[model samples]
Structure formats: structure tokens, C-alpha cells
Target: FVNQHLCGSHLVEALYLVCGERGXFYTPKT
Candidate 1:
């Protein structure tokens, strides 16, 4: 899993880096 390699806060940090800069356009699928 990516989480295992990515670790904890590092994952969040990476997400924020991408999202905060470009903004999140993610939509959850049903």
C-alpha cells in the first residue's frame, strides 16, 4: 500500500502540497 511506504504525516503533507497548490478536484465514487 502507498500508505505503508508514504508513512503518516508525510502522506498528508504531500496531499496538502498538491491540493493546496493546485486545489483538489477529487470526487468520491459511489
Candidate 2:
């Protein structure tokens, strides 16, 4: 969903925000 929707830094920021706001467990890689 993210890869198909977001681009470039937007994607990174999305991961950062979700991972930070939620937890590392929700992150894609880590």
C-alpha cells in the first residue's frame, strides 16, 4: 500500500511516523 501510494521521502517519513507513533513492531523491516 505504501510503496504503491507514497513516493521518495514521503514513504520514509510515513514509516518513521508510523513506527514512532505506534512502535517498531509495526514497522516494515524492523
Candidate 3:
């Protein structure tokens, strides 16, 4: 179910969290 339908959505979401993939992104280190 996870690896199907959505295709590579999981990888995308993971990258989003790690890379701060949001419209309004900010870094604590910044």
C-alpha cells in the first residue's frame, strides 16, 4: 500500500522533512 499508488511519495516526504521542504522554511542554525 505504501510503496504502491503513491509511488515515490514516501521518499519525497522524507526528503521534505530532512531538507525543510516547505513553502515557509527556516533553519535553527540560521
Candidate 4:
């Protein structure tokens, strides 16, 4: 799990997706 102020290294998929408690960081908009 990751926090808002700090990002935790929680990955998934085949080098395609990276998500956390905050949300997906694919677009850097979440």
C-alpha cells in the first residue's frame, strides 16, 4: 500500500501497470 505524500513500490501486470492505495500512475493524473 502507498500513501499520498509518499509513493510505495507496488507493481502489477507485465511492465504495463503500476498502482497503489492512491490510484493508477499511468497518466500521472490520479
Among the numbered candidates, top TM-score falls to: 2
TM-score per candidate, in order? 0.43, 0.48, 0.40, 0.17
Encode model 2's per-residue lDDT on 1-30: one tens digit a residue: 335688898877888886776444554666
Clashing pairs in 3: none
Which residues of candidate 2, in runs, are more than 4 Å off? Answer: 1-4, 21-30
How are the candidates ranked when ordered by lDDT, highest leading? Answer: 2, 1, 3, 4
Better model by TM-score: candidate 3 vs candidate 4 = 3
Q: Which scores higher on lDDT, 2 or 4?
A: 2
The CA lDDT of each predicted structure is 0.64, 0.70, 0.57, 0.42
Show where candidate 4 strays beyond 4 Å. 1-24
Give one digit per residue, the lDDT tens place, for model 1 in 1-30. 244467688877887776666444588343
Each prediction's RMSD to truth: 6.6, 6.8, 7.0, 9.0
Report the lDDT of model 1 for residue 8.
85
Off by over 4 Å in 3: 1-7, 23-30
Which candidate wins on lDDT?
Answer: 2
Q: Which scores higher on TM-score, 1 or 3?
A: 1
- TM-score computed on alpha carbons, candidate 1: 0.43
lDDT digits (tens) for residues 1-30 of candidate 3: 234443387766766777775543465543
Error of 4 at 6 (Å): 12
